[PDB]
């Protein structure tokens, strides 16, 4: 059964700036969450190179792209260490770290929006072309569970027992507000990891039209 929980007022006023900014950079939500599923890749290779049985549940290191034009929505998805429930609490949403409260008080004190690219905003830059996301993920040391927010002031956290099996990783999945479609075109895509993949070092793979295609 489903749990709702609130903000951290901070990470709320975050949600709020990117909701309502006109900053025109919106495409670098995709280079935020590429490096998220890069870092997540990261620690499982980390821990699994003096311990190889963390690799059983999914073998391979991958993060694959698939946009769906039937209903709007861009996944990300990663076979990298994944998040607990207490992970998904903990990580998106109800705690504020340093880095978020300097990047809210400079950024205020400022009113320089070009802030959101120099510095970023991390995961939540997903807001910036989604009106809804969703964000399934299975860890080692835990059941499979939905992480859940429309920007509210709450989120959601459910046991999965509706989704496919991730096995490991994370799956973000982005329901594309109505202006932002662009960014289920495949050429836009392609251009977008080229440009922030160099140092990347899992293969990356794009679903086409049906067909993976390898970006790296
Ligand atoms: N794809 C992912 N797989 C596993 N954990 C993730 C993923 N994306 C985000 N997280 C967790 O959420 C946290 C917050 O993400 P973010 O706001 O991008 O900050 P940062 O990238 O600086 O860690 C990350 O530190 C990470 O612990």
Same mark, same amino acid.
């Given at each position: 059964?489903?749990?709702?929980?609130?903000?951290?007022?901070?990470?709320?006023?975050?949600?709020?700036?990117?909701?309502?900014?006109?900053?025109? =950079?919106?495409?670098?939500?995709?280079?935020?969450?590429?490096?998220?599923?890069?870092?997540?890749?990261?620690?499982? @290779?980390?821990?699994?190179?003096?311990?190889?049985?963390?690799?059983?549940?999914?073998?391979?290191?991958?993060?694959?792209? !698939?946009?769906?034009?039937?209903?709007?929505?861009?996944? /990300? #998805?990663?076979?990298?260490?994944?998040?607990?429930?207490?992970?998904? %609490? =903990?990580?998106?949403?109800? !705690? $504020?770290?340093?880095?978020?409260?300097?990047?809210?008080?400079? /950024?205020?004190?400022?009113?320089? %929006?070009?802030?959101?690219?120099?510095?970023?905003?991390?995961?939540?830059?997903?807001?910036?072309?989604?009106?809804?996301?969703?964000?399934?993920?299975?860890?080692?040391?835990?059941?499979?569970?939905?992480?859940?927010? $429309?920007?509210?002031?709450?989120?959601?956290?459910?046991?999965? +027992?509706? =989704? #496919?099996?991730?096995?490991?990783?994370?799956?973000?999945?982005?329901?594309?507000?109505?202006?932002?479609? +662009?960014?289920?075109?495949?050429? @836009?895509?392609?251009?977008?990891?080229?440009?922030?993949?160099?140092?990347?070092?899992?293969? /990356?793979?794009?679903?086409?039209?049906? +067909?993976?295609? +390898?970006?790296?």
């Amino acid at each position: 059964s489903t749990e709702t929980f609130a903000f951290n007022a901070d990470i709320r006023q975050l949600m709020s700036l990117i909701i309502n900014t006109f900053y025109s =950079n919106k495409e670098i939500f995709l280079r935020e969450l590429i490096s998220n599923a890069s870092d997540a890749l990261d620690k499982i @290779r980390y821990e699994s190179i003096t311990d190889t049985q963390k690799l059983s549940a999914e073998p391979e290191f991958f993060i694959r792209i !698939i946009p769906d034009k039937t209903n709007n929505t861009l996944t /990300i #998805e990663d076979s990298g260490i994944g998040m607990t429930k207490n992970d998904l %609490i =903990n990580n998106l949403g109800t !705690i $504020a770290r340093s880095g978020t409260k300097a990047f809210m008080e400079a /950024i205020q004190a400022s009113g320089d %929006i070009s802030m959101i690219g120099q510095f970023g905003v991390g995961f939540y830059s997903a807001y910036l072309v989604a009106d809804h996301v969703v964000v399934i993920s299975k860890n080692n040391d835990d059941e499979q569970y939905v992480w859940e927010s $429309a920007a509210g002031g709450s989120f959601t956290v459910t046991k999965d +027992e509706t =989704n #496919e099996k991730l096995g490991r990783g994370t799956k973000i999945i982005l329901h594309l507000k109505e202006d932002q479609l +662009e960014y289920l075109e495949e050429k @836009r895509i392609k251009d977008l990891v080229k440009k922030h993949s160099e140092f990347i070092s899992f293969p /990356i793979k794009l679903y086409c039209e049906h +067909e993976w295609e +390898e970006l790296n």
